């Protein structure tokens, strides 16, 4: 299976600044549920930002880079090395890796951020016409969570 895991608000913001325009611990633990003991492949400036692989899953980086070379983490260089890897595999950002993935991905987890956020990257636009809603859960909102999110899981028709 590959699929894109992605965060975006209501205007498809994704990032500004190489970093997550919000804090939300819950997609955090969405992310950890859904990608532990998996495989994650991200674009450079992603895992640039996250400074070292996520713990318990395969973590690849997609760059021109051939002096890449880092400690727990996979490396490759080019798109189409993606579909050789085994198992289920997320896309996991960032807007350049979802730009290339959207047409060729089973399915998206998407945390729907119900807020405005500034933003300097996006997820590029989709329509519902496209893609089946597998399910749709709201998040709870509490102390250290305070911005409304709802998790959809959507299968290309
Ligand atoms: N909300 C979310 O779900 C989410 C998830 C992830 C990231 N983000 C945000 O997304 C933003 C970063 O996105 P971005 O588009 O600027 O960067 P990115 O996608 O993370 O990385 C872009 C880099 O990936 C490499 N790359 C992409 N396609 C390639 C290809 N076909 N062949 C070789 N290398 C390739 C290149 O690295 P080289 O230049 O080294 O060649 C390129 O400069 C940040 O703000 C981050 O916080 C948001
Ligand atoms: C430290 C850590 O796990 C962390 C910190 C900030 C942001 C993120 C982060 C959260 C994310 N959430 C979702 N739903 N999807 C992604 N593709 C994603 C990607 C990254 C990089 C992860």
Redesign the pocket.
Known sequence: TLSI????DLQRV???????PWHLPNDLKHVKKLSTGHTLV??????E?IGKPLPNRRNVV????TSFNVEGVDVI???EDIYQLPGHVFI??????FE?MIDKVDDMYITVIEGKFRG??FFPPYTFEDWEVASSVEGKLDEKNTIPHTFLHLIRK
Do not use: P, W, Y
């Open positions: 895991l992605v965060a975006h994704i990032g500004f600044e190489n970093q997550l991200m674009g450079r400036k992603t895992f930002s997609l760059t021109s880079d260089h080019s798109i996991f950002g960032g807007q350049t890796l290339e300097d990257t």
